[PDB]
Amino acid sequence: GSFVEMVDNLRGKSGQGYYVEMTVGSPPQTLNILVDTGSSNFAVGAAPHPFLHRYYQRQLSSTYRDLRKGVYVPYTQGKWEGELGTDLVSIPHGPNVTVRANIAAITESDKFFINGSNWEGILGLAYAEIARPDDSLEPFFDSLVKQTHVPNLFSLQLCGLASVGGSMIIGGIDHSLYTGSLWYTPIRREWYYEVIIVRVEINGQDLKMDCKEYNYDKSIVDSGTTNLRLPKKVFEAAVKSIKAASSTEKFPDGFWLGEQLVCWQAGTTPWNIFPVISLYLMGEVTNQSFRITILPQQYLRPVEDVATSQDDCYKFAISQSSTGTVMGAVIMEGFYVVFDRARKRIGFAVSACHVHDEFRTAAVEGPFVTLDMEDCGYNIPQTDESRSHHHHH
Ligand SMILES: CC1(C)Cc2cc(Cl)ccc2C(N[C@@H](Cc2ccccc2)c2nc(=O)o[nH]2)=N1
Ligand SMILES: [Zn+2]
Ligand SMILES: [Zn+2]
Ligand SMILES: [Zn+2]
């Protein structure tokens, strides 16, 4: 399983993430597993569901061990719950290794498995601190690295209902997947893949906010989120700016809320009137940053319609957040993204699968120098619950 074996090992549907094949148990049961850098549990459907046709059957695995401990995971949008255990786990199109990992067997869920998305489970690739029920449940990637010689790194090339492809290179960086410079921003703290944005520009114009507003209350890289999600004040200033640039076209309010498609005659979409967005990320060097520049074709996402085959129709894929900035697939589909856990940094390069425009290019460019920052990171108010918990590791 050299890096040629791992190229193209991702599939998905637009708007429902990317999954990789994994096997669980002995004899191996093959499942499609969502790649989720925004959570830290490995959890698989483990009972029948109307929208699943396979699921992990613990009773058919000779290597399964029950940990006799439940877990309940709520989301704003639904939930999953299940029974913790361990089993043997392998990635057939990844490194040639097998490991004993924690697995949550999902026994009940609500609004988690969607009609026809094709994944049966989720691979949380973030760190132990945010694992449920607590940080004592070792995430999959920590077990992989500890049990094998796989380097403590992985990279994602997400390529963008329409079918999508990409690659997850486990343990390395595949130079066939990008062009140009790889630029690294630091992992601010190991929980989410948290990073710090220092400046935002919409068509070359600076939003000019206090840069802490960009990271309120965090900014994270999240392959499990579709949109670019922006804190309220940032989202408002962004919408004001894009609306200004595209003011030839008066769209309804529901479009800007992502609740409604806007259309043009097939092949005639005026791409030029929608501006590029540049996010400047903290550099590895003090006072330096680099920018990642997003095309309009990344944040206005085509949705094919029944009554409008005559037309190219689009949904606005930037949305307001109350939980900080989220660089989801909208951002990641431009780029080859390196999750360099060994060196506590995330790299960005232009992807070999480009999502292209007539006259502009998704880009990664630096350096840009200032006088930083003067600290653009936000310090989340410490709860008594947080404060009192002992971490004896
Ligand atoms: C990682 C995962 C599966 C967690 C989740 C749990 C639940 Cl219960 C509902 C939706 C999501 C979700 N929603 C994604 C969309 C999605 C749905 C399914 C697979 C991948 C991504 C999202 N993007 C966004 O801008 O807001 N929510 N992503
Ligand atoms: Zn296969
Ligand atoms: Zn103690
Ligand atoms: Zn702890």
PDB file of C-alpha atoms in Angstrom, residues 11-155:
ATOM      1  CA  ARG A  11     -15.857   8.796  -2.954  1.00  0.00           C
ATOM      2  CA  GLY A  12     -19.001  10.806  -2.080  1.00  0.00           C
ATOM      3  CA  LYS A  13     -22.048  12.858  -3.149  1.00  0.00           C
ATOM      4  CA  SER A  14     -21.905  16.631  -3.327  1.00  0.00           C
ATOM      5  CA  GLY A  15     -23.074  17.951   0.039  1.00  0.00           C
ATOM      6  CA  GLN A  16     -22.713  14.629   1.908  1.00  0.00           C
ATOM      7  CA  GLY A  17     -18.947  14.455   2.424  1.00  0.00           C
ATOM      8  CA  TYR A  18     -16.256  12.019   1.392  1.00  0.00           C
ATOM      9  CA  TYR A  19     -15.899   8.422   2.485  1.00  0.00           C
ATOM     10  CA  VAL A  20     -13.057   5.874   2.423  1.00  0.00           C
ATOM     11  CA  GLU A  21     -13.448   2.069   2.527  1.00  0.00           C
ATOM     12  CA  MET A  22     -12.605   0.447   5.772  1.00  0.00           C
ATOM     13  CA  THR A  23     -12.906  -3.084   7.082  1.00  0.00           C
ATOM     14  CA  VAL A  24     -13.918  -3.962  10.609  1.00  0.00           C
ATOM     15  CA  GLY A  25     -13.668  -7.322  12.328  1.00  0.00           C
ATOM     16  CA  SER A  26     -12.701 -10.822  11.371  1.00  0.00           C
ATOM     17  CA  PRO A  27     -13.603 -11.922   8.862  1.00  0.00           C
ATOM     18  CA  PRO A  28     -13.497  -8.343   7.518  1.00  0.00           C
ATOM     19  CA  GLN A  29     -16.778  -6.501   7.021  1.00  0.00           C
ATOM     20  CA  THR A  30     -16.261  -3.751   4.387  1.00  0.00           C
ATOM     21  CA  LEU A  31     -17.988  -0.374   5.035  1.00  0.00           C
ATOM     22  CA  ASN A  32     -17.885   3.137   3.557  1.00  0.00           C
ATOM     23  CA  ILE A  33     -16.762   5.546   6.234  1.00  0.00           C
ATOM     24  CA  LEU A  34     -17.087   9.367   6.175  1.00  0.00           C
ATOM     25  CA  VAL A  35     -13.780  11.167   6.550  1.00  0.00           C
ATOM     26  CA  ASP A  36     -14.380  13.734   9.376  1.00  0.00           C
ATOM     27  CA  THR A  37     -11.553  16.005  10.558  1.00  0.00           C
ATOM     28  CA  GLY A  38     -14.094  17.739  12.764  1.00  0.00           C
ATOM     29  CA  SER A  39     -14.694  14.967  15.275  1.00  0.00           C
ATOM     30  CA  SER A  40     -12.770  12.245  17.063  1.00  0.00           C
ATOM     31  CA  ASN A  41     -14.844   9.050  17.272  1.00  0.00           C
ATOM     32  CA  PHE A  42     -14.812   6.129  14.987  1.00  0.00           C
ATOM     33  CA  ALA A  43     -18.476   5.114  14.857  1.00  0.00           C
ATOM     34  CA  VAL A  44     -20.312   2.714  12.529  1.00  0.00           C
ATOM     35  CA  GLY A  45     -23.929   1.834  11.897  1.00  0.00           C
ATOM     36  CA  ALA A  46     -24.420  -1.440  13.819  1.00  0.00           C
ATOM     37  CA  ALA A  47     -28.150  -2.161  13.432  1.00  0.00           C
ATOM     38  CA  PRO A  48     -30.694  -1.968  10.626  1.00  0.00           C
ATOM     39  CA  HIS A  49     -31.782   1.398   9.325  1.00  0.00           C
ATOM     40  CA  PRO A  50     -34.046   2.263   6.393  1.00  0.00           C
ATOM     41  CA  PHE A  51     -31.203   4.206   4.641  1.00  0.00           C
ATOM     42  CA  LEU A  52     -28.492   1.546   5.186  1.00  0.00           C
ATOM     43  CA  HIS A  53     -28.181  -1.846   3.559  1.00  0.00           C
ATOM     44  CA  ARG A  54     -25.048  -2.865   5.366  1.00  0.00           C
ATOM     45  CA  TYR A  55     -23.863  -2.248   8.894  1.00  0.00           C
ATOM     46  CA  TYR A  56     -21.373  -3.644  11.340  1.00  0.00           C
ATOM     47  CA  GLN A  57     -22.476  -6.935  12.841  1.00  0.00           C
ATOM     48  CA  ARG A  58     -20.482  -7.406  16.012  1.00  0.00           C
ATOM     49  CA  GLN A  59     -21.806 -10.980  16.397  1.00  0.00           C
ATOM     50  CA  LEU A  60     -20.107 -12.040  13.096  1.00  0.00           C
ATOM     51  CA  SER A  61     -16.661 -10.736  14.224  1.00  0.00           C
ATOM     52  CA  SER A  62     -14.493 -13.302  16.094  1.00  0.00           C
ATOM     53  CA  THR A  63     -12.155 -10.428  17.153  1.00  0.00           C
ATOM     54  CA  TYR A  64     -14.811  -8.139  18.634  1.00  0.00           C
ATOM     55  CA  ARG A  65     -14.574  -7.207  22.329  1.00  0.00           C
ATOM     56  CA  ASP A  66     -17.297  -5.298  24.144  1.00  0.00           C
ATOM     57  CA  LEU A  67     -16.155  -2.443  26.400  1.00  0.00           C
ATOM     58  CA  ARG A  68     -19.579  -2.495  28.217  1.00  0.00           C
ATOM     59  CA  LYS A  69     -19.942   1.289  28.031  1.00  0.00           C
ATOM     60  CA  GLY A  70     -22.521   3.365  26.154  1.00  0.00           C
ATOM     61  CA  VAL A  71     -21.977   6.683  24.353  1.00  0.00           C
ATOM     62  CA  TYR A  72     -24.535   9.334  23.343  1.00  0.00           C
ATOM     63  CA  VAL A  73     -23.497  11.977  20.801  1.00  0.00           C
ATOM     64  CA  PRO A  74     -25.846  14.859  20.145  1.00  0.00           C
ATOM     65  CA  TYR A  75     -25.585  17.354  17.328  1.00  0.00           C
ATOM     66  CA  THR A  76     -27.593  20.547  16.796  1.00  0.00           C
ATOM     67  CA  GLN A  77     -29.009  18.654  13.770  1.00  0.00           C
ATOM     68  CA  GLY A  78     -29.670  15.130  15.210  1.00  0.00           C
ATOM     69  CA  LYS A  79     -27.774  12.469  17.152  1.00  0.00           C
ATOM     70  CA  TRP A  80     -26.214   9.023  17.214  1.00  0.00           C
ATOM     71  CA  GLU A  81     -25.807   6.716  20.231  1.00  0.00           C
ATOM     72  CA  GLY A  82     -24.205   3.286  20.679  1.00  0.00           C
ATOM     73  CA  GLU A  83     -22.092   0.752  22.505  1.00  0.00           C
ATOM     74  CA  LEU A  84     -18.292   1.037  22.742  1.00  0.00           C
ATOM     75  CA  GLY A  85     -15.986  -1.886  21.915  1.00  0.00           C
ATOM     76  CA  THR A  86     -12.737  -2.678  20.086  1.00  0.00           C
ATOM     77  CA  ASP A  87     -12.074  -4.649  16.944  1.00  0.00           C
ATOM     78  CA  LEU A  88      -9.475  -5.121  14.211  1.00  0.00           C
ATOM     79  CA  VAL A  89      -9.606  -2.355  11.591  1.00  0.00           C
ATOM     80  CA  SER A  90      -7.917  -1.980   8.221  1.00  0.00           C
ATOM     81  CA  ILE A  91      -8.106   0.526   5.288  1.00  0.00           C
ATOM     82  CA  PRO A  92      -7.969  -1.647   2.112  1.00  0.00           C
ATOM     83  CA  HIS A  93      -6.848   1.265  -0.074  1.00  0.00           C
ATOM     84  CA  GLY A  94      -4.556   2.787   2.600  1.00  0.00           C
ATOM     85  CA  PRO A  95      -1.463   1.486   4.475  1.00  0.00           C
ATOM     86  CA  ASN A  96      -0.916  -2.270   4.599  1.00  0.00           C
ATOM     87  CA  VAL A  97      -1.547  -2.525   8.349  1.00  0.00           C
ATOM     88  CA  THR A  98      -4.274  -3.733  10.723  1.00  0.00           C
ATOM     89  CA  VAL A  99      -4.936  -2.193  14.100  1.00  0.00           C
ATOM     90  CA  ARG A 100      -7.037  -2.713  17.158  1.00  0.00           C
ATOM     91  CA  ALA A 101      -9.201   0.374  17.484  1.00  0.00           C
ATOM     92  CA  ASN A 102     -12.066   1.709  19.509  1.00  0.00           C
ATOM     93  CA  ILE A 103     -15.367   1.365  17.616  1.00  0.00           C
ATOM     94  CA  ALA A 104     -18.721   2.810  18.644  1.00  0.00           C
ATOM     95  CA  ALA A 105     -21.422   0.574  17.251  1.00  0.00           C
ATOM     96  CA  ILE A 106     -24.280   2.928  16.498  1.00  0.00           C
ATOM     97  CA  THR A 107     -27.493   1.359  17.776  1.00  0.00           C
ATOM     98  CA  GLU A 108     -29.893   4.337  17.289  1.00  0.00           C
ATOM     99  CA  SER A 109     -29.619   7.619  15.473  1.00  0.00           C
ATOM    100  CA  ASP A 110     -31.744  10.536  14.286  1.00  0.00           C
ATOM    101  CA  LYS A 111     -31.131  12.535  11.138  1.00  0.00           C
ATOM    102  CA  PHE A 112     -27.573  11.146  10.897  1.00  0.00           C
ATOM    103  CA  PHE A 113     -27.844   8.509   8.071  1.00  0.00           C
ATOM    104  CA  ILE A 114     -29.533  10.289   5.059  1.00  0.00           C
ATOM    105  CA  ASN A 115     -31.502   8.726   2.190  1.00  0.00           C
ATOM    106  CA  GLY A 116     -28.869   7.561  -0.368  1.00  0.00           C
ATOM    107  CA  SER A 117     -25.532   9.183   0.723  1.00  0.00           C
ATOM    108  CA  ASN A 118     -23.761   5.753   0.784  1.00  0.00           C
ATOM    109  CA  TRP A 119     -21.648   5.914   4.001  1.00  0.00           C
ATOM    110  CA  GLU A 120     -22.320   3.619   6.923  1.00  0.00           C
ATOM    111  CA  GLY A 121     -20.142   5.209   9.595  1.00  0.00           C
ATOM    112  CA  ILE A 122     -17.853   8.087  10.485  1.00  0.00           C
ATOM    113  CA  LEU A 123     -14.071   8.330  11.022  1.00  0.00           C
ATOM    114  CA  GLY A 124     -13.294  11.223  13.411  1.00  0.00           C
ATOM    115  CA  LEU A 125      -9.730  12.207  12.650  1.00  0.00           C
ATOM    116  CA  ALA A 126      -9.421  15.084  15.177  1.00  0.00           C
ATOM    117  CA  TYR A 127      -7.785  14.681  18.630  1.00  0.00           C
ATOM    118  CA  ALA A 128      -8.753  12.909  21.858  1.00  0.00           C
ATOM    119  CA  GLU A 129      -9.802  16.068  23.718  1.00  0.00           C
ATOM    120  CA  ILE A 130     -13.122  16.171  21.834  1.00  0.00           C
ATOM    121  CA  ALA A 131     -13.773  12.332  21.740  1.00  0.00           C
ATOM    122  CA  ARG A 132     -17.042  11.215  23.363  1.00  0.00           C
ATOM    123  CA  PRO A 133     -17.743  10.282  26.132  1.00  0.00           C
ATOM    124  CA  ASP A 134     -14.258  11.665  27.130  1.00  0.00           C
ATOM    125  CA  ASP A 135     -10.613  12.022  26.080  1.00  0.00           C
ATOM    126  CA  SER A 136      -9.704   8.607  27.435  1.00  0.00           C
ATOM    127  CA  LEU A 137     -11.233   6.960  24.331  1.00  0.00           C
ATOM    128  CA  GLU A 138      -8.209   6.818  21.953  1.00  0.00           C
ATOM    129  CA  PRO A 139      -9.203   8.019  18.467  1.00  0.00           C
ATOM    130  CA  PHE A 140      -8.487   5.805  15.492  1.00  0.00           C
ATOM    131  CA  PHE A 141      -5.495   7.767  14.120  1.00  0.00           C
ATOM    132  CA  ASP A 142      -3.684   7.741  17.520  1.00  0.00           C
ATOM    133  CA  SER A 143      -4.077   3.885  17.597  1.00  0.00           C
ATOM    134  CA  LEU A 144      -2.883   3.594  13.998  1.00  0.00           C
ATOM    135  CA  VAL A 145       0.301   5.567  14.697  1.00  0.00           C
ATOM    136  CA  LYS A 146       0.997   3.932  18.093  1.00  0.00           C
ATOM    137  CA  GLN A 147       0.562   0.333  16.820  1.00  0.00           C
ATOM    138  CA  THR A 148       2.336   0.604  13.458  1.00  0.00           C
ATOM    139  CA  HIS A 149       5.252   2.499  11.826  1.00  0.00           C
ATOM    140  CA  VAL A 150       2.789   4.810   9.899  1.00  0.00           C
ATOM    141  CA  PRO A 151       4.091   8.436  10.103  1.00  0.00           C
ATOM    142  CA  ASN A 152       1.977  10.757  12.201  1.00  0.00           C
ATOM    143  CA  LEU A 153       0.445  12.618   9.255  1.00  0.00           C
ATOM    144  CA  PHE A 154      -2.317  12.407   6.683  1.00  0.00           C
ATOM    145  CA  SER A 155      -3.404  14.546   3.745  1.00  0.00           C
TER     146      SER A 155
END
